[PDB]
């Protein structure tokens, strides 16, 4: 392994990317289906939709899948277009921290409403 990516080998990253991508496609389908049929949108319906357990659990799962997928993809992109070692390491650290903050904020927001 490369000791710096959220993966184990080529097959590991491949399968992880594909699974998290399927999950995120399902999440996008759900979100677009809601936003389309919502018609008129007010704070009332907004809170009624983001107050259900299914919606919040689904958003958290989508955030986790996004964490994994974005980590893999950004590691790939950085290894492709960043030759310097220290710069690439710092950029990947910033990206992973941003993704973990994404997940923690998604939580802090879903358990708040």
Partner 1 sequence: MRLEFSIYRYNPDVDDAPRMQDYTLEADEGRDMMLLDALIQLKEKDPSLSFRRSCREGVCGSDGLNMNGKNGLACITPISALNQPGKKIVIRPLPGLPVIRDLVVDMGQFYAQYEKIKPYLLNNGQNPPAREHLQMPEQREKLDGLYECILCACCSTSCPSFWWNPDKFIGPAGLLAAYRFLIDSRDTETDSRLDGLSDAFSVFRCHSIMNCVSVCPKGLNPTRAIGHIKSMLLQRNA
Partner 2 sequence: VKKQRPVNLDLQTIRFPITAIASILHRVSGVITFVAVGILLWLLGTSLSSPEGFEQASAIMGSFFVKFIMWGILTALAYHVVVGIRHMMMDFGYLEETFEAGKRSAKISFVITVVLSLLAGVLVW
Ligand X SMILES: CCCCCCCCCCCCCCCCCC(=O)OC[C@H](COP(=O)(O)OCCN)OC(=O)CCCCCCCCCCCCCCCCC
Give the binding site for ligand HEM (CB under 6 A): 17, 21, 24-25, 28, 66, 69-70, 73-74, 76-77
The two tokens of residue 56 are 């919040």
- Least distance in Å: CB of 10 to a copy of itself? 8
Near partner 2 by CB under 8 A: residue from 77, 93, 97, 100: 77
Residue 40 binding result from ligand X, ligand HEM, a copy of itself, none, given CB thresholds of 5 to 8 Å by partner type: ligand X
- Least distance in Å: CB of 84 to ligand HEM? 19
Near partner 1 by CB under 8 A: residue from 36, 39, 54, 85: 85
d(CA 16, CA 34): 27
Measuring CA to CA, which residue among 92, 103, 101, 97 is closest to residue 4? 92
d(CA 89, CA 75): 9
- Least distance in Å: CB of 12 to ligand X? 25
């Amino acid at each position: 392994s490369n000791a710096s990516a959220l993966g184990r080998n080529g097959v590991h990253d491949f399968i992880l990317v594909r699974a998290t991508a399927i999950v995120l496609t399902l999440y996008i389908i759900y979100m677009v289906g809601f936003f389309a049929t919502s018609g008129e949108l007010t704070y009332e319906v907004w809170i009624g939709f983001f107050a259900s357990a299914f919606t919040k659990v689904f958003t958290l799962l989508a955030l986790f899948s996004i964490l994994i997928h974005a980590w893999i993809g950004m590691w790939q992109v950085l290894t492709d277009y960043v030759k310097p070692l220290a710069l690439r390491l710092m950029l990947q650290l910033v990206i992973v921290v941003a993704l973990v903050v994404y997940v923690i904020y998604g939580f802090v927001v879903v358990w708040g409403v």
